[PDB]
Ligand binder design. Structure first.
Ligand code: LBV
Ligand code: LBV
Lengths: 315, 315
């Protein structure tokens, strides 16, 4: 991947189709507005950054949260959080808990660690695992790779109710082909369609080998900045590749709108450490898939990755 | 597997260590007393058999339930149940729902189909899937088969709190070896111990390739008969291999008591359709693992089966 541009907030250049592989998608300095995000020092728990919308979810102003400790804000979770994510743990490891809040439903908390920084995501949440347990029989009995792909896309559609679910396989030249598709009756088919490599550029493919699920809940929603935008530990951008709330590339969001997609989600299929493909999902309207369903999709992605490796070895 | 004896209730011979591979463990005509079981006609939903304890869980006498329809007893579930388990579906496929009941907690319903018979299990139930999602990173990063086994047993112990969790690998001669073990501090180690094939006889190993989880919740609990004991559709024994509530072999329950085990559970590890091993769990006291945790263990068993196949292929 040819070197990243600075983000727009550090004076970087505008993105065009001539340089899109240089967009620093991992450090947008902003989040999707269906949740809130805090970052905190990994030893002290001092809150270092806050999404500007944090008052809507946490009930205190961003500027008042800044500098407070997670021991003060989350006294019941802090010791567990800190034990679960020790220094040097994988940046994909998550601590999850459910918090009570004044509004309807609960608040889901998801935390991961990058270097000395803890990144906390808060999202409102008002049958999946057992449905997945059941689907494993048909995934196992699938006779070959294409049959497995067909079962996988139908299974994902059943779990999620997404309008369209595709298995998008990368060729060695990074072009893609839709090798299986489950879709709502009425929808035009992408099955068999092939696409240039530019649609999922090299830096995206690299990120997707490390952090295996990403989404855009509402393809017209404006991003919410982090404040301060730079991590004070480093005076540098905050890596958000491990946060589902990370703001999506505006170039990709424009692609999705042009395609008539209101909500998008994909899960990586990783085989021998290489990005083999994506389970790629669309909805016609905005849709926040709940955290527990996302966890189910992650698990299915891992299972599918392994089955692909096993079915491919039959050849 | 050399042919089954009739069960004791059809005049079959007593089991000894000279003939234990002939015990008809799949048709004990009885269940474990921590739940209730009904069987029903697969088209009409007519209740055909009832565990003698059914009044404790369902609030009507076994003899009064007999002949009533699932449309009458479970009006909210029957159409979904019937659609989920059509004639000829795999006998391992499950329909699951949660029912309200007068006592504390809920009643978990699990249904599967064998031939023209639906078998319904009812058990009281008052973090697992996400913990499994997390453990998949360490299972993937395990460098080889033994390391994977070590991670798997620790993971299962963390999910369940079982006193002992072993990976019990079968050799080609059906003898076993404990190749990984996670256990409570203080417990004597079985790591590296080898055991004759007789401890898990051929009919058991065969059943365990078809129905991948089984348990004994309380190794001193008396079984509860089914009434009538024979399925009226067939005038023959009711196959219970697909029911976790199935009564355990008394010979095995005696083995467990002799070993100081109060509760036992295992999950099959199946590779290329062959029984490779078991995740074998013990608790020192009785323990009913909740249905949702069992589902998580099934999912882990499938994942582990695939990882074993992939790690073994590195050789
Ligand atoms: C010049 C840059 C472009 C570009 C950049 C871009 N694309 C992504 C991410 C995705 N693009 C995807 C492509 C498809 N989805 C489809 O449905 C089809 C065809 C039917 C295609 C070809 C997909 C699946 C992704 C992954 C994300 C998702 O699942 O929604 C990114 C990275 C986005 C991010 O994670 O922030 C970027 C920077 N796309 C272009 O088309 C050109 C203009
Ligand atoms: C003559 C017959 C015998 C016999 C029969 C028998 N055994 C089983 C099932 C199991 N036996 C197991 C063996 C072990 N568990 C351990 O912890 C160790 C060693 C540390 C061993 C060797 C296991 C794991 C099972 C599976 C069930 C479970 O997980 O609890 C059956 C079938 C039981 C059923 O499903 O109804 C039978 C009939 N066992 C003997 O020792 C001899 C006397």
């Amino acid at each position: 991947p040819l070197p990243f541009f600075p983000p727009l907030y550090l004076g970087g250049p505008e993105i065009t189709t001539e340089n899109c592989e240089r967009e620093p998608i991992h450090i947008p300095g902003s989040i999707q507005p269906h949740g809130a995000l805090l970052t905190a020092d990994g030893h002290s728990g001092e809150v270092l950054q806050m999404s500007l919308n944090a008052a809507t979810f946490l009930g205190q102003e961003p500027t008042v949260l800044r500098g407070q400790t997670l021991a003060a804000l989350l006294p019941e979770q802090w010791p567990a959080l800190q034990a679960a994510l020790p220094p040097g743990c994988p940046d994909a490891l998550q601590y999850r808990a459910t918090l009570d809040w004044p509004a309807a439903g609960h608040l889901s908390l998801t935390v991961h660690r990058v270097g000395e920084l803890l990144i906390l995501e808060f999202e409102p949440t008002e049958t999946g695992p057992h449905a997945l347990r059941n689907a494993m029989f048909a995934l196992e009995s699938a006779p070959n790779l294409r049959a497995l792909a067909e079962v996988a896309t139908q299974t994902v559609r059943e779990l999620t109710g997404f309008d369209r679910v595709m298995l998008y396989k990368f060729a060695p030249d990074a072009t893609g082909e839709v090798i299986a598709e489950a879709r709502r009756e009425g929808l035009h088919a992408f099955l068999g369609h092939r696409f240039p490599a530019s649609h999922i550029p090299a830096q995206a493919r690299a990120l997707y080998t490390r952090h295996l699920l990403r989404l855009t809940a509402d393809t017209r929603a404006a991003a919410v900045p982090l404040d301060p935008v730079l991590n004070p530990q480093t005076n540098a951008p905050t890596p958000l590749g491990g946060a589902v709330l990370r703001a999506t590339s505006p170039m990709h969001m424009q692609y999705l709108r042009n395609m008539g997609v209101g909500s998008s989600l994909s899960v990586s299929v990783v085989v021998g450490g290489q990005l083999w493909g994506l389970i790629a999902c669309h909805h016609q309207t905005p849709y926040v898939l709940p955290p527990d369903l996302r966890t189910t999709l992650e698990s299915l992605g891992r299972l599918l990755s392994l089955q692909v490796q096993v079915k491919e070895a039959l050849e």
